[PDB]
DNA sequence: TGGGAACAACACGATGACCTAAGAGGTGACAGCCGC
DNA sequence: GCGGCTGTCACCTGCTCATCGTGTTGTTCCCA
């Protein structure tokens, strides 16, 4: 997700169906793309 | 001329040429489209005085160009012969009303010929209402009005080319012939000293295959370039041998997938580059190959010939061979060289003639092309004239120029200069010519040639900088579209009257003095050295008698919007270019006033303008309302000049017009009778004249923020009308016909009780937001009648309105009072587009006084936001007790570099407190007493020319004659400065305070229109996202840098919340709403709909993009 | 300053804007003022 | 929402998706404004255009809630569901691709080691290629 | 080198149960009617989504096949047909990578479904980070 | 020419079908 | 409701035969295709 | 079999609107 959102979204989407590779909702940017509360500042599972 | 009002200059040398009309380039060129009278008597004139002239007008030629046209066969025959006009139906204020465009009818005689009867038939053919231009200069369209800009391009020729191989670090040249219509073949040369063709920008070959796939054969190249390394060197790498093989091979690499034949390949090639019609080399292209490739007269409405492609290559080799002078290709000598992109003979201008006249082209061919469809395809004895022409090609060509291009945009009528330089700007950004970021650096930059012709110091401040520029003072477009700029003959180093006009290729032949260079009673010079602008770009002092020409003016270089700006010379470029951008935005208002210190330059450029109502002839004055002007002529004839009245501009301004004669009064032709808006007596008034003290004060105007003083909202000095139009439309829709009617269902009685009995609101009424400015109602809404609710209705007894009210109301946020009712319909004779029955448009007009808000400016780029509203008695006031009007921090005067502000206050203040410098021996007064400046009443109006303006030491000393007030009390010390009290503890300041008068403009950026807001409103269709635009009650675009900026502040749930319940998320932005008003917590957040239609989007590009759960499918 | 193609003019601008550049003087200092805004019109895209 | 996977959408796959085949060329009449059958925008495989109606107007009533029509073949439902509901077209020549063939290097298949210029005639019918070959029968 | 690079995508489909075959395509899905809407402008005009033109060429051009292939045409007129199916379903997937773009009304290019992901202003780097927001409002700026 | 020249409305302008025209329920 | 007339559908296939203009980006990264 | 170079793929950036080729059928209107 995050490599897609940054640059080259056809090649990105391209080797990650070819890899049938999933993406893990760990990271910022892919947790915002989702609408989630980032895993940073007040949003960890510690303070959540 | 003489009867301009008084102004005081402190010019010290004469300029002997007066600027032109600063509206010929587009008129004269407009002329010379229609060949209308003026254009005849502006030829027969030139060649009276044996100029340079076009002979032939431009539709003229225009309809030789299609005049010829046949069948297959040729069996028969059309042509077109001369044209002319009929007087247009309409007026220019019909058409402005009306919405209709300012066009007169265009009539031909078509000719129509069977060549094997030997039959002619002549018929005159409608060819449409050609759009007239204004006298202006604008073009009035579908009831608007409009400019079309003249284009910055590269001009037809040839240009020789050089760069560098980089990993080779080997020298490469490259030539390139530019038709005007046609297409190019890019020659490259030194690659590994191999000469090769480029043909319609296709796959490169070698040089010796084009020349083979012509005459030429390989024992007469080697005998006229038995010289020469490279293109040896390519002949022995061609393998093709002979002419045939080399069409068939051309033919090959040009148009694969074909079979090669020689009858293709030759009748592609003629077509392409050698037929008048598909290839234009036209006289400006044909002139500038002639000229540097040395060609002596070809035909001069021709195109490439062999011999042009063979003295390119003769140049280009010689380029290669390091030959700097040669002899051009039958011709005179030559001198071979690499030419610029920038320089002013490789760029040309397309005026608005030239560009009418492509469109034109364009509409007539395709004319052209159905006239030979109904020539083939229809049979003799029944075909005349009108029976094979259609005309509508050429209407919708016109129309979509004038509708639809780039270069034809709407007029700028903040005020008269920024419409005036409106037109006079030479775009590039545009069809034909360059991009935004195509454009590098060398297009963006001033050239030396730019001296005379384009303004170095006027250009947008964004992305166009350098693209969109503005026609000098003095700049004349040449026939080929080129500038020229006027230069005095200096003859044997004495000066002379005798005025010259020099475009940049000539102006880099010769050594230019300067208008202000020291000159005696005798023209001779009088210094040893004169210092002098040489060719390229070179500053070079000479002795004086070897000086060949001398500028005409010392502002000649200056456009006019920066030759408003006086104390030129004393500020950086940058500040130049800010102010005199952002002179252009000014607001004009109700009382306006020349600037108390200005340049020479008011009066020319309102004059010149179209804003100022001028005599057409000498005579009297009889009689003088607010609303027209009656004048007896001395011919014996009467004219009624109507004047203009709070009427709505492009931007929201006003037009109104105040008159400046009483009814005695004796007129000559070209005399102002009344002034436009931002006008003082046919000179230009954008701004008004304050009071200010260069300080800071308690913060208010810190960081270029400003501080004025409330006599100016009181005396409404800063204060102007704007008038906004709420148009609307009653459709006939499928379930029956909209109508404007008063009766709006289900109303209370108070909100239409200001509305006319026809629906619409009564004219002086005030307005507020939720006001109905027209009262309409849909026919019927299919909303409820289902055969539920119509067994309900039918058991009511009552057949409750289906109606739905969508009357017109007052946005929210605006007021003002009702200035006007326009209303069209169907069932009288206006026009009206296909479906709207009524057409009605209300002008509301609002009164706006200067706030904390808006924004101020001068014209030195010192511009600032207004902060603080002091009373009058709170603001610094001088000895005897004025007030000042504005207070200016002084920090930005040195940071930014402008300290020529400082220099117009002093010169403000010392005009408005005159002087009496009469006798007193002294240089400055010297020179203020011989120029005619020495004694000057208070109030008086001066003049400082942008580049022979005041001096410092003059305005120094006569700070020190300034005619007192009480006593000999003169607050300005000659320091420039005064002493100031504190209005709001009355101790005098420590140290003496730099005051005096600037002219302040209130520019078009208002605090109203920006102020934008919004909690819930129109979302988008794709995106369930909030829409953007102030209009539609947008949202604020929060980009991926605050997302960022959130993320680092550690702020989780602010961004969770802000991304979906503010934005995007269909059941959370209901919900958040409904808990707010009811009161609860807001809701926790859920999936985006951008996610949505981003996997949605993306399984439609087969992907199987599943929101998987570590146990299974995750919820959607 | 810089004059045109990035090079140095060899006669300098021997007045200060408070005594009063010349015409020439003038047209000469331009260059540097336009090539400085387009460079930072461009150099904000860039870093971003 | 544990994690998102891509791979190959099979022809399967994509039939599963769909609730009908889109076999017209056509949007909407142009005179009425309304949607046509078995075309792009149509009715009866994506969603009812107006919320609890029907192509024909037999269960125009808003009182049915899912239903299928017995006419025209919508079913009664809210409005929304055309932004969610997906189709397929069933080809009759199988095409590859754009992506992942013709397309960056290193995602340009490689399965079947050929040159883009003979997958380039291969695919755009401008050259043949054998699928198979009987070498044990041939020898 | 390269049986290393071809390596890495013959792993990638072996070590994985998504199967080689779906890089050839029988079906084509079309996105949702509403992603893709077509609206009523005023004087009787419709501004609609590219995808509809591009989709409405796949269609035409697999019906002529269809067609073709029922009357039995010869080699060459059902190749070419073939072709073209090809060309269509290319620009409906990616419109500039191979040969010239469809145009749509003026001379720009048409939209496909891949340039509706990628780019600035694509559906990642325009609605998914980046979002206009509600209860939001600006104004010019004065010092307090 | 004739499939052409009738009710030629059908724009396909997705600059506004998306940004220009909102939603009927905002 | 009669004739008088407008659009949407259709079915065929008028002794003659080819585009059009537009069109100056720049800089990396790389893997092929062609040459040794 | 291993180089050059040579393209090809990434990124960076932004209101007008021109017709055929004939002839016929059936519905759907417009008038009265
Ligand atoms: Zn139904």
Redesign the pocket.
């Given at each position: 997700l995050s490599a897609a959102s940054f640059?080259?979204?056809?090649?990105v989407l391209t080797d990650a169906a070819i890899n049938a590779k999933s993406d893990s909702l760990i990271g910022l940017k892919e947790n915002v793309i989702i609408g989630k509360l980032i895993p940073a500042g007040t949003g960890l599972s510690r303070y959540r | 001329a003489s009867t301009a009002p008084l102004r005081i200059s402190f010019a010290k040398i004469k300029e002997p040429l007066e600027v032109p009309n600063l509206l010929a380039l587009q008129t004269e060129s407009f002329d010379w489209l229609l060949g209308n009278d003026a254009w005849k008597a502006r030829v027969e004139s030139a060649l009276e005085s044996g100029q340079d002239v076009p002979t032939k007008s431009g539709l003229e030629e225009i309809f030789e160009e299609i005049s010829p046209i046949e069948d297959?066969?040729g069996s028969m025959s059309l042509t077109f012969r001369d044209h002319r006009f009929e007087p247009p139906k309409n007026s220019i204020d019909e058409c402005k009303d009306r919405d209709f465009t300012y066009a007169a009818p265009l009539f031909v005689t078509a000719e129509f010929t069977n060549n094997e009867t030997g039959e002619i038939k002549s018929q005159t053919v409608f060819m449409g209402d050609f759009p007239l231009m204004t006298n202006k200069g604008t073009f009035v369209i579908?009831g608007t009005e409009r400019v079309v800009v003249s284009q910055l391009?590269?001009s037809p020729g040839v240009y020789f080319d050089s760069s560098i191989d980089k990993?080779?670090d080997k020298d490469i040249f490259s030539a390139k012939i530019i038709?005007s219509?046609?297409?190019?073949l890019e020659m490259e040369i030194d690659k590994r000293d191999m000469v090769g063709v480029r043909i319609?920008?296709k796959?490169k070959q070698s040089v010796t295959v084009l020349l083979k796939a012509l005459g030429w054969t390989t024992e007469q190249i080697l005998e006229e370039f038995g010289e020469y390394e490279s293109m040896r060197a390519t002949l022995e790498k061609d393998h093709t041998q002979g002419q045939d093989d080399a069409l068939l091979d051309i033919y090959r690499k040009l148009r694969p997938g074909e079979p090669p034949?020689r009858?293709?390949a030759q009748?592609l090639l003629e077509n392409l580059y050698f037929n008048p019609?598909?290839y234009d080399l036209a006289k400006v292209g044909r002139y500038k190959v002639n000229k540097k490739l040395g060609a002596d007269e070809p035909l001069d409405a021709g195109v490439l010939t062999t011999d042009d492609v063979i003295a390119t290559i003769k140049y280009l080799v010689k380029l290669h061979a390091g030959e700097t002078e040669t002899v051009g290709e039958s011709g005179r000598e030559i001198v071979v060289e690499t030419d610029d992109?920038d320089h002013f003979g490789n760029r040309r201008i397309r005026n608005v003639g030239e560009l009418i006249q492509n469109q034109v082209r364009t509409g007539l061919?395709?004319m052209e092309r159905?006239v030979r469809?109904?020539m083939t395809?229809q049979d003799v004895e029944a075909i005349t004239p009108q029976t094979l022409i259609?005309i509508?090609?050429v209407?919708?060509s016109i129309?979509?120029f004038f509708?639809?291009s780039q270069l034809s945009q709407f007029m700028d009528q903040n005020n008269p200069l920024s419409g005036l330089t409106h037109k006079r700007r030479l775009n590039a950004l545009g069809?034909?010519?360059?991009?935004?970021?195509?454009?590098?650096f060398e297009?963006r930059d001033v050239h030396p040639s730019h001296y005379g012709r384009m303004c170095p110091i006027e250009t947008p401040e964004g992305?166009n900088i350098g693209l969109i520029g503005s026609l000098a003072s003095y700049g004349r477009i040449n026939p080929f579209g080129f500038i020229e700029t006027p230069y005095r003959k200096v003859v044997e180093g004495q000066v002379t009257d005798d005025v010259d006009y020099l475009t940049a290729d000539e102006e880099d032949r010769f050594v230019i003095a300067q208008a202000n260079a020291a000159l005696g009673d005798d023209m001779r010079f009088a210094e040893a050295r004169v210092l002098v602008r040489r060719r390229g770009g070179e500053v070079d002092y000479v002795p004086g008698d070897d000086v060949d020409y001398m500028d005409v003016s010392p502002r000649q270089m200056v456009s006019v919007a920066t030759a408003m700006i006086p104390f030129l010379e004393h500020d950086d470029a940058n500040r130049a270019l800010m102010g005199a951008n952002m002179m252009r935005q000014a607001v004009p208002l109700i009382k306006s006033e020349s600037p108390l210190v200005g340049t020479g330059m008011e009066y020319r450029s309102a004059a010149d303008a179209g804003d100022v109502v001028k005599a057409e002839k000498a005579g009297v004055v009889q009689e003088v309302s607010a609303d027209y002007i009656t004048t007896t002529n001395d011919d014996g004839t009467y004219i009624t000049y109507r004047l203009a009245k709070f009427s709505r501009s492009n931007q929201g301004t006003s037009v109104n017009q105040k008159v400046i004669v009483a009814e005695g009064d004796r007129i000559i032709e070209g005399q102002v009778l009344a002034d436009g808006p931002a006008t003082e007596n046919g000179e230009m008034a954008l701004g008004k004249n304050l009071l200010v003290a260069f300080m800071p004060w308690e913060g208010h105007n810190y960081e270029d923020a400003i501080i004025l003083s409330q006599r100016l909202v009181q005396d409404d000095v800063l204060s102007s009308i704007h008038i906004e139009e709420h148009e609307v439309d009653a459709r006939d829709t499928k379930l029956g016909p909209e109508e404007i009617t008063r009766d709006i269902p289900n109303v209370s009685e108070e909100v239409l009780a200001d509305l006319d009995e026809r629906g619409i609101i009564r004219i002086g009424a005030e307005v507020v937001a939720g006001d109905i400015l027209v009262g309409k109602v849909t026919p019927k809404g299919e909303t409820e009648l289902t055969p539920e609710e119509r067994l309900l209705r039918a058991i009511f007894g009552e057949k409750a309105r289906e109606v739905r009210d969508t009357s017109l109301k007052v946005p929210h946020g605006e007021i003002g009072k009702v200035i006007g009712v326009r209303v069209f319909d169907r069932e009288e004779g206006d026009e009206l587009p296909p479906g709207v029955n009524q057409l009605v448009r209300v002008y509301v007009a609002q009164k706006r006084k200067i706030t904390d808000g808006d924004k101020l400016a001068g014209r030195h780029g010192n511009k600032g936001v207004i902060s603080k509203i002091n009373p009058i008695e709170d603001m610094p006031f001088l000895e005897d007790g004025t007030p000042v009007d504005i207070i200016l921090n002084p920090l930005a005067v040195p940071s930014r570099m402008n300290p020529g502000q400082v220099l117009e206050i002093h010169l403000g203040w010392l005009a408005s407190r005159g002087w009496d410098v009469s006798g007193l021996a002294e240089e400055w007064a010297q020179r203020l007493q011989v120029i005619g400046a020495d004694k000057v009443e208070p109030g008086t109006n001066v003049a400082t020319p942008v580049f022979d303006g005041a001096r410092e030491d003059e305005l120094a000393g006569l700070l020190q004659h300034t005619i007192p007030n009480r006593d000999g009390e003169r607050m300005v010390l000659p320091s420039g400065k005064a002493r100031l009290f504190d209005g709001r503890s009355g101790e005098p300041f420590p140290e003496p305070i730099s005051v005096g008068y600037m002219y302040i403009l209130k520019l078009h950026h208002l605090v109203d229109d920006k102020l934008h807001a919004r909690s819930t409103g129109p979302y988008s269709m794709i995106t369930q996202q909030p829409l953007g635009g102030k209009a539609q009650f947008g949202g604020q675009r929060f980009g991926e840098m605050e997302v960022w900026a959130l993320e680092a502040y550690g702020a989780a749930y602010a961004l969770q919340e802000l991304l979906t319940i503010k934005s995007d998320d269909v059941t959370g932005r209901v919900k958040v709403y409904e808990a707010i008003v009811k009161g609860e917590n807001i809701p926790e957040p859920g999936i985006p709909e951008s996610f949505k239609v981003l996997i949605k989007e993306m399984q439609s590009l087969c992907l199987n993009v599943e929101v998987l759960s570590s146990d299974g499918m995750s919820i959607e | 300053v810089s004059n045109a193609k990035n090079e140095t003019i060899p006669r300098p601008i021997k007045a200060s804007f408070r005594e009063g550049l010349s015409v020439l003087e003038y047209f000469i200092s331009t260059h540097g003022a336009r090539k400085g805004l387009a460079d930072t019109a461009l150099r904000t895209?860039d870093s971003? | 929402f544990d994690e998102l996977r891509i791979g190959l959408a099979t022809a399967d796959d994509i039939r599963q998706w769909s609730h009908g085949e889109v076999k017209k060329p056509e949007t909407i009449?142009?005179?009425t404004l309304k949607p046509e059958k078995d075309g792009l925008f149509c009715e009866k495989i994506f969603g009812p255009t107006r919320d609890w109606e029907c192509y024909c107007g037999k269960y125009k009533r808003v009182r049915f809630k899912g239903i299928i029509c017995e006419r025209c073949g919508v079913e009664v439902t809210r409005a929304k569901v055309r932004r969610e509901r997906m189709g397929h077209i069933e080809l009759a020549a199988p095409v590859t691709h754009i992506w992942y063939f013709?397309?960056?290097?290193?995602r340009?298949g490689?399965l079947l080691d050929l040159?883009?210029?003979d997958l380039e005639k291969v695919i755009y019918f401008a050259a043949y290629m054998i699928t198979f070959v009987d070498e044990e029968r041939r020898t | 080198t390269?049986a290393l690079?071809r390596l890495k995508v013959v792993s990638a489909f072996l070590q994985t149960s998504n199967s080689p075959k779906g890089m050839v395509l029988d079906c084509v899905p079309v996105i949702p009617p509403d992603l893709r809407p077509m609206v009523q402008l005023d004087g009787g005009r419709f501004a609609t989504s590219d995808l509809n033109d591009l989709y409405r060429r796949v269609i035409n051009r697999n019906n002529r096949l269809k067609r073709l292939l029922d009357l039995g045409a010869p080699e060459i007129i059902v190749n070419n047909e073939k072709r073209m199916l090809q060309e269509a379903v290319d620009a409906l997937f990616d419109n500039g990578?191979?040969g010239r773009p469809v145009t749509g009304?003026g001379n720009r290019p048409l939209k496909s479904l891949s340039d509706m992901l990628?780019?600035?202003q694509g559906r990642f780097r325009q609605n998914l980070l980046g979002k206009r927001v509600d209860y939001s409002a600006r104004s010019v700026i004065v010092v307090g | 020419?004739?499939a052409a020249?009738?009710?030629p409305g059908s724009?396909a302008?997705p600059?506004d079908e998306m940004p220009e025209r909102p939603d009927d329920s905002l």
């Open positions: 640059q080259e979204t056809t090649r | 297959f066969s579908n391009v590269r990993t080779s038709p219509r046609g297409a190019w319609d920008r796959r034949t009858e293709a009748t019609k598909r992109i061919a395709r159905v469809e109904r395809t259609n509508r090609p209407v919708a129309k979509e509708g639809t069809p034909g010519g360059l991009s935004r970021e195509r454009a590098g297009v992305p | 895209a971003g | 009449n142009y005179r013709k397309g960056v290097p290193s340009l490689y040159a883009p210029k | 390269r690079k990578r191979r009304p990628k780019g600035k | 020419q004739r020249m009738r009710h724009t302008v600059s």
